[PDB]
Amino acid sequence: QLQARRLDGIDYNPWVEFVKLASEHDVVNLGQGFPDFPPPDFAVEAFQHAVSGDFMLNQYTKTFGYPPLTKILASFFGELLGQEIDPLRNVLVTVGGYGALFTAFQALVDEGDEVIIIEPFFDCYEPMTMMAGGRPVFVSLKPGGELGSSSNWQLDPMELAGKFTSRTKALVLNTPNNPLGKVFSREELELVASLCQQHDVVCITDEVYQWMVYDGHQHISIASLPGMWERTLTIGSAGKTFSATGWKVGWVLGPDHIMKHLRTVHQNSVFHCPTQSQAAVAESFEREQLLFRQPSSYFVQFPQAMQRCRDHMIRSLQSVGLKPIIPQGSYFLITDISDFKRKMPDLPEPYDRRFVKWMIKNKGLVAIPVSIFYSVPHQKHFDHYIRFCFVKDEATLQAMDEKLRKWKVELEN
Amino acid sequence: QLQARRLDGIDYNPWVEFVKLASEHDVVNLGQGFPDFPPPDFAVEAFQHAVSGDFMLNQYTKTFGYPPLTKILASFFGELLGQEIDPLRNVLVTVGGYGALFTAFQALVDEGDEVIIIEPFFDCYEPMTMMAGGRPVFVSLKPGLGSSSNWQLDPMELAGKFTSRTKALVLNTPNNPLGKVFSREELELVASLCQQHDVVCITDEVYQWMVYDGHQHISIASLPGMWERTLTIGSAGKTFSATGWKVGWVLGPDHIMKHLRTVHQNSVFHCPTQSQAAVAESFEREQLLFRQPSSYFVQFPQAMQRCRDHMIRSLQSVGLKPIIPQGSYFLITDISDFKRKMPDLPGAVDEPYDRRFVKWMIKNKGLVAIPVSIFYSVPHQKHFDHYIRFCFVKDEATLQAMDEKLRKWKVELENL
């Protein structure tokens, strides 16, 4: 005792141990999920205009979000979703997409409620479900020349339909997917959409990477699917949108009859979000609406630039025998290390975690074992994947190449 | 169904309903709890250095707080508390003191746990306790021009509230709304009662720099053997008059802090990097200029003490009897004279008087105050319906506009 019950089990964070080993050794870091280059000019300038503009911006703003920010969000994503969005009832600014999730979990998930989670998942889905008193129900994506694609990682309609029960309160969908990089097709979404409707289940859709799409694929918001607006909470992140993760500004879009409860959580937790950062994000969105689908917009330019970095890393990793799975989205790609697993199983606990450590110590490269994105039971079978982030400065990628090339020489001498 | 159980009852917010009325009418707003003047130059400049400095500040910082910020917090309040503070185990940067409170409640308060709360309280204490599954135990301050100092805490009644279910006691000093600064006698009473019943003490000290009339803020965490049981909360917004920054922190022992860290990384994980760097920079200057006449921690309370004294005499001229605060942004006034000479005020049945009065004052006099009723538990609202709260931390222009409104009221009182 002398502590809360909801903190049971959820106290351990696997992310940290790797950060500890990484600092100790000289390494090229590809495990970090943030860009190591500056945000675009208009984004940085917008923040400078907020701190050097009206002095009244240094004080409290309205509780459910800076009104200019809520307005642009409503009108911009309104068009995109093809939906009438009321900036008061349908929008809520949160402390990043992380806070957005938390707000949603606390508002809807109760004691003994079930939450369907798709593996591999953004790891925080499980603790947040547990802390909310609910119990996570996991459904697994099945993995699919020499290279794999994130598109052929299938969602078996059987196993999914079987997981739905009368206790199922919510389904958490993350697209584009972290860590896999999978972008969900209309077929897959309509499957989820119809199952949620049939079982009367709320769908929390994590779309923080909706702008990071490659190879002509387009992001499809499940909230725009027929009759799904009534049941979905759409989450986005300003940090991942404008490559400014240290801003920690997020938002949730949904119907009033659901949003009202998230508002309750909000004003009984943080009440306010920082005023200036909201104004910066508000300004940045105004420009992107003005330049929408135009070749000089950041939403067109940045994914193309990052797709180039994606393509780079994929071939670079191939040169050492790692088999990457080509992502259609997100900041990340994962690589299969099965070949390393059989040719080198004697590593000094799921295998990929041992592999990453060995790679940090001996090769000077940092990746993330996908094990931590899987539920503890399923960690036995999916112990042979690791995650790289290709959203890095070109210098970082060049440093990676040198390390990768020394790896050849290490094997060749 | 289709919603969580913890959101029961806590869905209604009394603050909002007044803002609706205030917005529609032409009024001088003294109900707002934020300064309507800019933050000090060094504070604003510090924020500009963060957004125009290293580009790496635009990205994630360490999960439990920006390392330079945690360090200065540790060394600065370390000296103040007279305690060795480890920036890793003893410090946690949160989304303002509001987030700080929330983190503490979620970490410690469980199902059926009791939380001792002192009336009048910062209203959010009751919902946060309820949502955490705990049930609030209220103890009332008794009134003795009036002073916030003689609002006494009965040692008999207080000791009676402590049970084996009592998990935590929430102490707010300097107090919102009352403005009371707790004496060493009162703190030692609380301290010994908490120790004897093995109870954690969450102390809200966001106004610790706002102290007047030569009174000093005493942190209960510095009392002998209290560091082991206390979580100390502060806010950068209230500290540097920059409420829109929403940066806060909690200081305590590791064996308690570890659980707040669990809550933190399973909720928001990160706090904004740049705002933290600004607060870190602002604190560095104030440590450098500590107790010196050119520091903000010396100048600002002095400047605000005048605004207090100003408002106190201005409100008297209309028959309002203020209770002189020793701290915080606020003073409350007794409206009992208005209550007997004018009880016929319109409103819903079983609606406390000060709420009817504040409405009446906005509509007819063009002044905004806050009914203290919302700082009391619903049962106790029957007895404490005759106080309203003013915020005197305003620009001099706002105070002048207040005087003009008050003088029209006076002339109104000098004829009709």
Curated annotation (Swiss-Prot), chain B:
Keywords: Aminotransferase, Cytoplasm, Lyase, Pyridoxal phosphate, Transferase. Its main location: cytoplasm. GO terms for biological process: biosynthetic process; kynurenine metabolic process; L-kynurenine catabolic process; response to bacterium. Inhibited by tryptophan, indole-3-pyruvic acid, 3-indolepropionic acid, DL-indole-3-lactic acid, indole-3-acetic acid (IAC), amino-oxyacetate (AOAA), aminooxy-phenylpropionic acid (AOPP) and Tris. It catalyses: L-kynurenine + 2-oxoglutarate = kynurenate + L-glutamate + H2O; 3-phenylpyruvate + L-glutamine = 2-oxoglutaramate + L-phenylalanine; an S-substituted L-cysteine + H2O = a thiol + pyruvate + NH4(+). Pathway: Amino-acid degradation; L-kynurenine degradation; kynurenate from L-kynurenine: step 1/2. One of its GO terms (molecular function) is protein homodimerization activity. Its EC number is 2.6.1.7, 4.4.1.13, 2.6.1.64. It is found in: Cytoplasm, Cytosol. Pfam families: Aminotran_1_2 (PF00155). Coiled coil: none annotated. It comes from the Eukaryota. The modification N6-(pyridoxal phosphate)lysine is found at K238. GO terms for cellular component: cytoplasm; cytosol; mitochondrion. InterPro entries: Aminotransferase_I/II_large, Kynurenine-oxoglutarate_AT, PyrdxlP-dep_Trfase, PyrdxlP-dep_Trfase_major, PyrdxlP-dep_Trfase_small. Its cofactor is pyridoxal 5'-phosphate. Substrate binds at G33, N176, R389. PANTHER family: FI04487P (PTHR43807), KYNURENINE--OXOGLUTARATE TRANSAMINASE 1 (PTHR43807:SF14). Belongs to the class-I pyridoxal-phosphate-dependent aminotransferase family. Catalyzes the irreversible transamination of the L-tryptophan metabolite L-kynurenine to form kynurenic acid (KA), an intermediate in the tryptophan catabolic pathway which is also a broad spectrum antagonist of the three ionotropic excitatory amino acid receptors among others. Also metabolizes the cysteine conjugates of certain halogenated alkenes and alkanes to form reactive metabolites. Catalyzes the beta-elimination of S-conjugates and Se-conjugates of L-(seleno)cysteine, resulting in the cleavage of the C-S or C-Se bond. Homodimer. This is Kynurenine--oxoglutarate transaminase 1.
